[model samples]
Target: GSSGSSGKPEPTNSSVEVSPDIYQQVRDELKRASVSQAVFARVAFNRTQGLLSEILRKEEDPRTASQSLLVNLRAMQNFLNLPEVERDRIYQDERSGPSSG
Candidate 1:
């Protein structure tokens, strides 16, 4: 038997919530764009690692077409599947909160 310690278990992760919302207005637009998981992954990969350059460059990637689509704010301020450290970087950047250590 062990004596009770006066400490609560602490859980940790860098995820700080930047998702605009599940029912985000972009959903309707995304439905039209019909973004597949591959394209979705591409968005996350291209946005997170390549930083500002690719995000903006790809902004006009399909520009010379019938019309460009899926340039939603989620692509800019939001993404998934980013590298651990940098993902936190952006997550923290957007949420930008102070934590007590």
Candidate 2:
């Protein structure tokens, strides 16, 4: 699907990829609906967002931090929620690939 074959299905939003072995591990955890990783990711993302917001505020204006944090937080939330379409978009952006169309 990523290769631009029209017949294949496109990826969904909020997906993440790991190595095959690690993917299996994640799948097992997912099947269990593990909360540990979810909690950790939330905390990690919040802290990271906070620090970034602070840095941006110091360099820019108060509005900058608030607006930027809101955007980033929403994006992170979307990713965490497993929106496959958004996930594919993120992956594409990260890899500098073409948009999902």
Candidate 3:
């Protein structure tokens, strides 16, 4: 496949498809952070720790499921952490908030 450039301006323009509004918020928030995948692998373990184990014991293998299922949950960690950080909420409010420099 050879091409000069790519537009990629399909229906998948990062707005996310209609589903749960909460997931949409999570998707938008995650668009803020840029981090490593290896870091993601552990954050899920530390944050949910035993709950993941409980579910893993109930249903399927943790290894494959971690790669597939927990892959999505990893973004939840970033989205949750950033919004909880002191200044991150400023991005949401168009009113009196932290001034960008």
Best by TM-score: 2
lDDT over C-alpha atoms for residue 55 of model 3: 38
In model 3, which regions exceed 4 Å deviation? Answer: 1-19, 36-83, 86-101
lDDT of candidate 1 over 1-101, digit per residue (tens): 98886977985654233333322322332353444323333454343324333334444333331222234333433454345456445444544554855
The per-model lDDT (C-alpha) reads 0.39, 0.40, 0.37
The TM-scores, one per candidate, come to 0.24, 0.25, 0.22
Clashing pairs in 2: 12-84, 12-85, 13-83, 13-84, 13-85, 13-86, 13-87, 14-83, 14-87
- Give the alpha carbon lDDT tens digit for every residue of 1-101 in model 3: 77687675643223222223433443344354332222322332233424433433343332344554554444344435443453243333313344687
TM-score of predicted structure 2: 0.25
- Model 2 ranges with Cα > 4 A deviation: 1-6, 11-65, 83-101
Steric clashes per prediction: 0, 9, 0
Alpha-carbon shift of residue 84 in model 1 (angstroms): 2.4
RMSD list, candidates in order = 13.4, 14.9, 13.8
Return the number of clashes found in candidate 2: 9
Lowest-sum lDDT 10-residue window in model 2: 15-24
After superposition on all CA atoms, how large is the RMSD of candidate 3? 13.8
